Design a binder for this molecule. Structure first.
Ligand SMILES: Nc1ncnc2c1ncn2[C@@H]1O[C@H](COP(=O)(O)OP(=O)(O)OP(=O)(O)O)[C@@H](O)[C@H]1O
Ligand SMILES: Nc1ncnc2c1ncn2[C@@H]1O[C@H](COP(=O)(O)OP(=O)(O)OP(=O)(O)O)[C@@H](O)[C@H]1O
Ligand SMILES: Nc1ncnc2c1ncn2[C@@H]1O[C@H](COP(=O)(O)OP(=O)(O)OP(=O)(O)O)[C@@H](O)[C@H]1O
Ligand SMILES: Nc1ncnc2c1ncn2[C@@H]1O[C@H](COP(=O)(O)OP(=O)(O)OP(=O)(O)O)[C@@H](O)[C@H]1O
Ligand SMILES: [Mg+2]
Ligand SMILES: [Mg+2]
Ligand SMILES: [Mg+2]
Ligand SMILES: [Mg+2]
Lengths: 408, 397, 397, 408
């Protein structure tokens, strides 16, 4: 062979947040916030100090998380939901096993309507009750009837199967062309390789060998992923689930399309800037094309969903989506699907995330009294995922052909 | 220390009165002594007396019996009848004479009735259901009440007639009781391990089975071990529970009148065929029809079991779902009178019973209800039906 | 009809006394008021008082506690001690100061004791076993007694002190009770659906949990919901049962003396370390050692549970098997006196508890026993220990 | 091909006992017995009228079966067991869920000590409490290590496996040479064929194709099998389980031995004459060589075991064996093993049965107070089984070679 490739199943597990200095760095940050707080009057809050960004909301939530998570199942940041509808009121969402009348809650349990954080920036606190295939020509094509491979296509390891998310290329090294899907779909620890096939692996049925997972990430610290401390727990991780599969050397890349079937041509990834106005993400209509539920549409309901489970480990998921018109946004098997902003002004729809859709990252949510609870879906921030995997999205077939010729 | 006395032990009483020789011989003597233009049955007592006397031939090739009105082509008649439930109703051509049920039975004293054959076997969302399950500012009939593992519906606001005369509520036995626990604490709408809620109190007393002669005042059959399913539980409100948050209204129904005793000697149509309703935590407000009374057991034990009230929901819809256990069964208003409660739903629904009425539809669910007048007597409870009477009951505890 | 009155309903009482504010405040007031050459504990009361006062720090990193004598290198000492049960006993090098248990605790009044750490967790064939299981011409302590699904051992011949003063027997609660059944009939040795046997009678009354202050006469701990596992059931003999076939002897032991009350103020070695025996339907005659008293709960409820007696069988053999539930725990004769019963086996054994004593052997089974004196008081029963006293009891029913 | 073979899975099920005349024939027999009974005194029974045969005992049992089976789990005929030992006292054995003292039984339940039947013949009634691998060089050889096939060898269909019982030849038709095993081991209804292999079928491991089941019987009426009515039920059947497998046309019969390994050369089948003295069967020591437990020894404890289960169907099993010295006589997998009388006077051991060892034909029995219950085994009467299948046993290798040359 020409160059040396890694020939070992090799695993690195996080230890940085377990260094006394790394925990002290987080403790010092919140100690600083606490030392300077000087909370405002028993009273009125100025409008210019109202939170106006994801980062504004996430810092208020982190600062007040002990009281917030004492009698709740989780929190996220977004807009207050009132009578089932999104308002334009910036808010921390507090998820509860069941919303009950104030009269059945002592004052310690009853959430406040307003929280003021460090620097005087304040926001609303909203209470949301919360818990943790299709037949069409499109679904047929995604699962094997189509002459091309692309976003939405079924991708299968020996064990599980999911949805190809995007056509991508490595920024460094061999600069190989491949695809992005989620890590759980693509990986099984009982095997030394992770081969992927479309539509099925040889033990289960017909299919072409697409290539094998080269690298994948599951957990990333919040301070590395978001650039801030998103909570006070020294062990805080984002489920940054993602796997990169370089196309096999004898796989015909001319069968790959960069089009998202059912959507059309998409634009470049839209990064989530934590400092821009909330309404460029929260409340935006999204769509996804998956091998299980085909094309669906939904609403981004919240960002940076937090969950505290068995040990003193805090877990974040980036994007919370609910399907429109009381239809589920996804099903099991849609994991890896691209989460795409629908066009507002005629611009190409742009991807913002990839469906996580896994172990505990699908559940139910209650919005109205006249109808049953609704499924919610979780997504990983795509701009951040591409950064950690060091990949670029390829959005045109002309750019795909250039990228193939430029592999080394 | 404390001022008054109350339960400090989980203490169980089990029935033994019917196992006495003299008790069984009294029952055998009654029937042994007893053994067509006959002044034909006009009351529940008349039908139950005929069925008890003929229970042996009736139970031989059947799944159980009840009393009511003959059902013909799926419609209730006004013909007084013993209903005989069978696993499958088949043409008379396929039955030997011993198996084919009669059309008429004559009982002691010449009182007679008809015999009818019925084929038989043993979540909703709304603003109302949301109020019952935690969104309302009050607790009352229909509210979700929860033990650590099981959930049901509060039936009535009640007061004990004796002892500490405590105010509390009535619900069903095993919505309220978990045998892994030494106490029986109940919450609205959820226990703390599952979600938020107010601690209501704990079960103080409950009853499950009662002998037929004590419950009905008559021998309901020839089996010396005959019992009635009487699964009711009484929960006194906790010392720190604010009873000013309690309503005596039945939301979705309104103010109710006093309990309507089921008198076995009154005309059959004052109970059979009557329209009823219920407000429950799972299905909200539903409407149904009383189809039968005093249904027997078919569970192979060797022991007769009775259930008081059989209800089928109107327009082929289910009258109750699981979680409606404990809801009040209420006679709907007919001539302007306040609706009056006659029973309480016995939970069921782990293995539902269904009955076949017409050939063009599948079988329909049926609901069991416990006779409320008799249940209140056995637990020595008075129902409280106005908020002013409730304030009085609180002061008198 | 009948002449005397008896139970006609399955009726359940559940404890609520400890849920009163005044009851819990009395307990909190007692301990709040309370808060090394100290006249060091000499009785069960002394140890239980120290353990209750320090229960919070003791229960923080432990699976439960009991009182007795320190165990050192697997052998019982005569050193009065609180035993602290842990999931695994580890070297002090691996414990922070908050976790490492003390060696000495001083309680109210300066009374002190030792603190000991024990690692812990929650068929035989013979001529005797054949006699107990149906081959003997008599029924007595040790005989197999069976419900429709569960089987156990008859504990004692007893008489009710009040009401009908009926003669019957004492056994454990859930050998005797099946919650699917309205009655609780028991047979020797098998119910009719399984094999031949004589109908003994049915359960009349039973108790499972009792508050600690009512059972022990003291607060056994700081938890306002503290209960004792008191699972005993009383079965009056059936009207047609021939009590002349009943013996008061304990086969394999002999004539027993009266129940030996466990007095909390007497010296510890009159109970702790005492040799005991038991005659049970599954393991026949076994011998064991009383290792501890008043063991606490560790079951995460939020509720303290107590068990009275902890027994480990001698020579590394099990003291009981499943089916021995209900056997009498009897102090063996030491100076010629008749053996005297002190407890009754609480069944267990679905998920046995074991404790580690030495490093060269696996963990050993331990047996739970219920304090017999207190159980008899709570069910208002007198034990009958001679056949002449039994004839008297029969005549006086 | 030369001659025509059956090319269909074809099933015949008994209907004869359902004819009104066949039920009347049985009813008339017991009606005759009842009409003439004239029972003896409240008292003494003559010795010359004491039952002295299997047939004597079986007729007393049939005549009195209503009272016998009212409070019992089954009956058999044999010798009274007293304090765990066989006596020489002819008796009906009555099997009970548990033996209890008389004092716990009303007089209706308590069995009598004596029963007198038609003709004045009488017998004892005995009460018995009752309910429903190994590593050695021999077991290795039986399961595949041996160079030969013979009695005791493992024989496997695709699903189950058992023990080859005897080398046999058909009395009629093609007169093919093959082997006898039990029907349940050899047969599965989901397949059209029943191929048998030693030691394993191809889906499970290595093995040679032995041939396929040609014919098998499961249930035979008592009056056909025993030559008498063994009970009053118009639906009475013997579990006459047996399957005949002719050796495949390309199977090398020179690999077959007629020796019973661990026993030696055996004699001809010993028929069970229902009129001969009881002690030529009851109480006799037996042995069996099976693929699961190898060579074991046991005692014939009883004959014509009766069982009444769900419908009004009475079932008989011929031979009841208990292992010696509290060792189990067989295990699952020994089904089909030959049940052989050990030598008394130096004569070759002779086979009397074949282990049924199946659905409900193994259970436990209590004999002593100082020890736990013991396993019992069931066998099918071999002389009768060979008659119904029309087969002869081959007991010498010289006779085997003659039989092969004489196949047509
Ligand atoms: N810890 C809690 N658990 C459950 N319910 C709670 C809790 N704290 C508050 N609530 C309920 O949530 C209510 C506030 O809900 P929320 O903040 O969503 O109001 P809103 O957005 O103005 O209106 P809407 O309820 O229609 O969304 C309180 O009035 C109370 O009934
Ligand atoms: N033991 C039995 N098991 C099953 N079916 C029986 C049995 N005995 C009678 N039947 C059937 O039930 C019929 C009687 O039905 P039933 O008494 O309900 O009549 P109906 O009320 O006049 O009419 P409908 O069938 O419309 O209700 C018999 O004619 C026979 O076909
Ligand atoms: N919370 C705890 N969990 C587990 N092990 C503990 C804990 N606290 C103390 N220990 C261990 O138990 C030891 C004390 O044991 P213990 O009191 O039984 O001593 P001993 O009776 O003198 O000797 P022996 O170990 O022979 O019984 C400590 O030295 C420590 O190793
Ligand atoms: N229906 C029955 N169910 C259970 N046990 C019974 C029944 N009828 C009788 N017995 C018991 O069986 C006893 C008779 O047993 P059996 O006929 O085996 O006696 P045996 O052979 O002389 O002695 P051994 O009991 O030592 O075998 C009776 O005394 C009685 O205790
Ligand atoms: Mg809201
Ligand atoms: Mg009808
Ligand atoms: Mg120690
Ligand atoms: Mg015997």
């Amino acid at each position: 062979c020409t160059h040396t490739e890694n020939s070992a199943a090799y695993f690195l597990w996080p230890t940085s947040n377990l260094q006394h200095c790394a925990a002290e760095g987080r403790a010092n940050y919140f100690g600083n916030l606490q030392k300077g707080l000087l909370p405002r009057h028993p009273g009125r809050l100025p409008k210019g100090q109202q939170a106006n960004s994801l980062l504004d909301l996430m810092t208020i939530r982190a600062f007040h998380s002990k009281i917030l998570r004492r009698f709740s199942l989780g929190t996220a940041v977004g807009f207050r939901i009132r009578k089932g509808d999104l308002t334009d009121i910036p808010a921390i969402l507090v998820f509860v096993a069941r919303k009950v009348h104030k009269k059945w809650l002592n004052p310690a349990q009853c959430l406040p309507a307003i929280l003021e954080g460090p620097g005087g920036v304040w926001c609303d606190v909203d209470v949301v009750e919360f818990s943790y295939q299709m037949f069409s020509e499109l679904v047929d094509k995604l699962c094997g009837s189509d002459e091309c491979i692309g976003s939405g296509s079924q991708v299968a390891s020996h064990e599980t199967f999911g949805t190809l998310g995007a056509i991508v290329k490595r920024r460094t090294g061999n600069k190989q062309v491949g695809f992005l899907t989620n890590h759980h779909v693509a990986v099984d620890l009982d095997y030394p390789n992770q081969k992927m096939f479309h539509p099925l692996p040889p033990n289960l049925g017909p299919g072409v060998y697409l290539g094998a997972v080269e690298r994948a990430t599951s957990f990333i610290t919040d301070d590395v992923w978001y650039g801030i401390y998103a909570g006070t727990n020294p062990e805080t991780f984002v489920r940054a689930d993602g796997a990169f599969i370089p196309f096999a050397d004898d796989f015909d890349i001319s069968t790959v399309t960069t089009v998202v079937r059912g959507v059309g041509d998409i634009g470049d990834v839209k990064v989530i800037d934590l400092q821009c106005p909330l309404n460029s993400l929260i409340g935006r209509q999204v769509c996804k094309v998956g091998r299980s539920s085909g094309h669906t549409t939904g609403t981004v309901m919240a960002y940076a969903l937090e969950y505290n489970d068995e040990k003193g480990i805090c877990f974040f998921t980036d994007i919370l989506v609910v399907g429109e018109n009381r239809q589920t946004f996804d099903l099991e098997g849609d994991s890896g699907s691209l989460i795409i902003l629908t066009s507002q002004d005629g611009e190409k729809p742009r991807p913002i995330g990839i469906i996580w859709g896994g172990t505990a990252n699908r559940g139910r949510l209650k919005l109205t009294s006249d109808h049953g609870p609704e499924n919610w879906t979780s997504g990983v921030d795509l701009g951040r995922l591409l950064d950690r995997l060091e990949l670029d999205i390829i959005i045109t077939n002309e750019s795909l052909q250039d990228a193939v010729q430029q592999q080394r």
